[PDB]
Amino acid sequence: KVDILYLEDDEVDIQSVERVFHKISSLIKIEIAKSGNQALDMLYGRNKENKIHPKLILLDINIPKMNGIEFLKELRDDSSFTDIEVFVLTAAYTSKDKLAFESLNIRGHLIKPLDYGEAIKLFWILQSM
Numbered sequence: 240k241v242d243i244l245y246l247e248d249d250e251v252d253i254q255s256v257e258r259v260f261h262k263i264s265s266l267i268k269i270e271i272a273k274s275g276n277q278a279l280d281m282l283y284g285r286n287k288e289n290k291i292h293p294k295l296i297l298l299d300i301n302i303p304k305m306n307g308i309e310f311l312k313e314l315r316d317d318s319s320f321t322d323i324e325v326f327v328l329t330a331a332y333t334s335k336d337k338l339a340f341e342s343l344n345i346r347g348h349l350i351k352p353l354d355y356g357e358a359i360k361l362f363w364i365l366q367s368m
Contacts, residue, residue, distance in 0.1 A: 241270045242365050244281065244293035246310070248273040248302060256297070259358045267362065275310035282320065294368050295361065296325045297353075300336065311343045324364065328353055 243260075247253050253271055260267045270291055272278035277288065284290025296314070300307045307327065314320050327340065330351045340348075346364075349357050 241268050241291040241293040243267070243269045243295045243297055243361070244272055244278060244291065245269055245297045245299075246272045246275065246278050246305065246307070247297075247299045248305065249299070252299060256353050256358075259353060259355060260362075262355070263358055263362055267365070275305055275307070275313075278310060279313065282314075293323060294365055296323055297328055297349075297361075298325060299328045301329050301331070301351075308339055308343075311340070311345070315343055324368070326361070 245253070245256060247256070257269055260269060270281060270293065272281055277286075278296075280286040280288040281291050282293075298307050298310070299305075311325065314323070314325075324346045325344070326347050326349055327336070327345055328349045328351060329336065332348045332350060336348070
C-alpha cells in the first residue's frame with residue numbers, strides 16, 4: 240500500500256521529497272505525517288486516519304518540536320512495526336545522533352537534501368524488501 244511514511248512538517252521539504260521520488264516513479268506511494276502523534280495515528284488507523292503499513296519510515300530529525308526519539312522508542316516497542324525500516328534525514332548528523340539511534344534499529348541516515356542519489360537508493364531497498 241504505502242511505500243514510505245515521511246514524518247515532516249516543512250511544506251517545502253514535503254514537496255521536494257515527493258518531487259524527487261515522483262521523477263523516479265509516480266507509483267511510489269508516500270504518506271506524510273506532520274507530527275509523531277499523527278504518524279502513530281496512521282500506523283494504528285485511529286483519530287480519523289486510515290491504517291497504513293509502510294515499508295519505510297523517513298524521519299526528519301531537524302524538527303525540535305517533533306521528538307523523533309520518543310516516536311522511534313514507541314515504534315520499536317510494538318512488534319507490529321518490527322519489519323518497518325527507518326531512515327533519519329537531517330541537515331547535520333552528529334555524534335549525539337549516532338549514540339541516540341544505536342539501539343533503535345535505524346537502517347541509516349541521509350543528509351539533506353534528499354536528492355536523486357538518495358531516493359534511488361531507497362527505491363532499491365523498497366524493491367529488495
